[PDB]
Design a protein around this ligand. Structure first.
Ligand SMILES: O=C(NCc1ccccc1)c1cccc(NCc2nnc(-c3ccncc3)[nH]2)c1
Length: 457
């Protein structure tokens, strides 16, 4: 069930289609992964059209004593970094190269076979109509109120995914349409930018009787389950999870989304032990209007979320992180003392209770927790103006390189062990394919091999 590119004859209609939408510009095509890759290859076949690139690639062949794959790597790693797609002496020279690249070389690209190939891939993208036959479904890996989550392979590329499959009957029966759709909106806002610390969405589709989210596969269970098996974590182990989560929150806050349900059961591990924030059903967009409602899990909600009538924003999440990091070190939320099932008492504690930190805690850790758990939003870490940057700058993360955190170069502390009619109208607009995600999927699976096969035909 693999991919078949349409024949080159679609070029005229496709080129015109995109021109009418003003999408045949350097900024539009170059910022797409598949556009970048094909434009890169065009440049590399016709280096003469970019004066500085000829001499450079002539010198590298002599320096490395080569026998094509290097050309691509050097373009991606070195050339792109130096040109970027604090004042620099070479600024006018960077502009000259880039102006030639986005003008005369782009134009010649538009007129070449390589743009015909971009039109073919782009046509396939606009023809995505996902059903359950496009996936091969394996075992259950998660359960919830309206449905469950399965492991699966998408047939045409072979990429493994998680398929969150909500049952429409059960949604109707429990009167939770608004929240199922909220998850779809929230995922849509968050799943751009390619972030490694959030369980993002690639596709959404629906059947007669099921809503389906295709999501990043997280195979290794959640931090709640692992905390009960491992026991509490040291400061060194918790730092790893904290750093990765702080970057997940930064990403969400940058897109004006408060998450509101930050807690260990909502932190999933992959098979390597790296983590992502999952379940955005309770998250809220705060770009237009700030939410007031008390939403979350009781030992994890911030004072401003609980206080009656007070508006709140991303500030909530930093407090929730404070509660959650304490839970990883101590086995319980700070404001749930003796495994209480008294929600009123937990909330009173959240506002009034002085959190007693043991001597074993380092002063650096105390600084962090006392910062995150500030009850006034005006004095809390993360809320003084500069967001996640203020939290990264804590002395608990003194020795971390945040670039390496982002790139996932730090070793994880725990490696999981291997092994009616009107109602259907509500779910129109539910189908979505996030372009960036599909292109990334194609790039990393079958792009090269389909291009070679097509080139032969
Ligand atoms: O509708 C739901 N929840 C609604 C709700 C929430 C809170 C209280 C009342 C109702 C619902 C439905 C299926 C599952 C889950 N949560 C588990 C989960 N979420 N993502 C994964 C996952 C597993 C592997 N890989 C990637 C993702 N697993 C919640």
């Amino acid at each position: 069930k693999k991919i078949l590119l349409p024949e080159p004859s679609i070029r005229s209609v496709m080129q015109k289609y995109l021109e009418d939408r003003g999408e045949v510009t350097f900024e539009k095509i170059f910022s797409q992964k598949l556009g970048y890759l094909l434009f890169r290859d065009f440049c590399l076949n016709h280096l003469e059209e970019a004066r500085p690139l000829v001499e450079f690639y002539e010198e590298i062949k002599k320096y490395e004593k080569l026998e094509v794959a290097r050309s691509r790597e050097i373009f991606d790693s070195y050339i792109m970094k130096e040109l970027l797609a604090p004042p620099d002496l070479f600024q006018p020279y960077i502009e000259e190269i880039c102006q030639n690249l986005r003008g005369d070389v782009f134009q010649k690209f538009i007129e070449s076979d390589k743009f015909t190939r971009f039109c073919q891939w782009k046509n396939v993208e606009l023809n995505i109509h996902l059903t359950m036959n496009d996936f091969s479904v394996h075992r259950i890996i998660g359960r919830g109120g309206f449905g469950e989550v399965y492991g699966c392979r998408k047939a045409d590329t072979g990429k493994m995914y998680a398929m969150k499959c909500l049952d429409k009957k059960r949604i109707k029966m429990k009167q939770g349409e608004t929240l199922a759709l909220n998850e779809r909106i929230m995922l849509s806002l968050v799943s751009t930018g390619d972030c490694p610390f959030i369980v993002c969405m690639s596709y959404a589709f629906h059947t007669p009787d099921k809503l389906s989210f295709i999501l990043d596969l997280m195979n290794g269970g959640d931090l709640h389950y692992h905390l009960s098996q491992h026991g509490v974590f040291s400061e060194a182990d918790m730092r790893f999870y904290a750093a990765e989560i702080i970057l997940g929150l930064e990403h969400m806050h940058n897109r004006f989304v408060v998450y509101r349900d930050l807690k260990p059961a909502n932190i999933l591990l992959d098979e390597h032990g790296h983590v992502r924030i999952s379940d955005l059903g309770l998250a809220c967009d705060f770009s237009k209007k700030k939410p007031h409602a008390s939403v979350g899990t009781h030992g994890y909600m911030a004072p401003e979320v609980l206080q009656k009538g007070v508006a709140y924003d991303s500030s909530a999440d930093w407090f929730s992180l404070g509660c959650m990091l304490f839970k990883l070190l101590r086995g319980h939320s700070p404001f749930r003392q003796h495994k209480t099932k008294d929600k009123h008492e937990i909330d009173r504690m959240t506002l009034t209770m002085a959190v007693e930190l043991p001597d074993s805690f380092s002063p650096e850790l105390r600084s962090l927790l006392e910062g995150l758990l500030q009850r006034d939003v005006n004095r809390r870490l993360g809320c003084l103006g500069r967001g996640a940057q203020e939290v990264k700058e804590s002395p608990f993360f003194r020795s971390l390189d945040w670039q390496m955190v982002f790139l996932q170069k730090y070793p994880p502390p725990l490696i999981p062990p291997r092994g009616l009619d009107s109602d259907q109208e509500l779910y129109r607009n539910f189908p979505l394919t996030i372009s960036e995600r599909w292109q990334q999927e194609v790039a990393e699976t079958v792009f090269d091999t389909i291009n070679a096969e097509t080139d032969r035909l």
